[PDB]
Chains A and B, each alone.
Chain A
Amino acid sequence: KLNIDSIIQRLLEVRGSKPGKNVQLQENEIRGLCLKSREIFLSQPILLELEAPLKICGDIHGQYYDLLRLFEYGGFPPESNYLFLGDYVDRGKQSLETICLLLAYKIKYPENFFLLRGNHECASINRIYGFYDECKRRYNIKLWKTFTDCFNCLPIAAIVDEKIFCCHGGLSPDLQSMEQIRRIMRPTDVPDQGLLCDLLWSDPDKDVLGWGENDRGVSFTFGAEVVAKFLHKHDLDLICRAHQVVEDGYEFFAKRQLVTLFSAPNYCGEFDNAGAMMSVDETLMCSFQILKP
């Protein structure tokens, strides 16, 4: 029914055009991407259990030409495996092309391309922070609501070769075992505080050692001891997360037991940060590829 290969060709056609140049797909092609990827999301576990080699990327926030640059450096799928940590939309000027490209690769390569839920993949957040407005401007509100139904099915966490725990935000004082994540039911919005809310929203903090208050107005901060306890309980080496704007594109927290990834250089046009992607090779060795502001 849906021509995946022609959607991707048209999305990749603007490689080497002036940044900001739109790919105006048909509404029914976009609806097709949302409904087909949703079925793929629902057939795969909510806790992904992935294997290296793998490229891990943090927030994109609709910077579509920076996503194209990440693929240039890392190899366009299926040349590399990918895990994205969420926050595909809002802030940037081309959320639509960004999420369409990622959803198209997910349909095309469903065992080699993976996407986590971020906090901007929630209707209440992407309504305010740009994605509703981009949808209204370029298509309509009904298509914005179709994306909502797709985002509600996204998986929440990943474990890479039994050693790297990946999610968007971070930890929860409610999180006792991995099984707790596993029967969070989908589709779900995030209607209350608690585990799923914390996985999308929580932040490390150097000046709390346990659990602390979060300046975002939601969820918590966690310190180095929290991370240490969690990794040792579940026999893990590293938390890989995203969610926070960092100067170098990547930043270590909690005695290098956590790393933050941010894959959108020069965020909002206003911060002068770099972007970063984490390459985990086949022998569980990590390296960082930097994308300049």
Chain B
Amino acid sequence: XLXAXXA
């Protein structure tokens, strides 16, 4: 979830 390009 850190931003989908990727938790």
Contact = CB atoms under 8 A, between A and B. Distances in A.
Interface residues of A, number: 14
A216 B4 CA distance: 5
Interface of B: 2, 4-7
Contacts of B4: 215-217
A271 B7 contact: yes
A269 to B, nearest CB: 10
A270 interface: yes
Contact of B5 (A216, A268, A273): A216
Contacts, number: 22
Contacts of B6: 216, 244-245
B7 A267 contact: yes
Nearest to A244: B6
A125 B5 contact: yes
A270 B5 contact: no
Interface in A225-278: 244-245, 267-268, 270-271, 273
A88 to B, nearest CB: 16
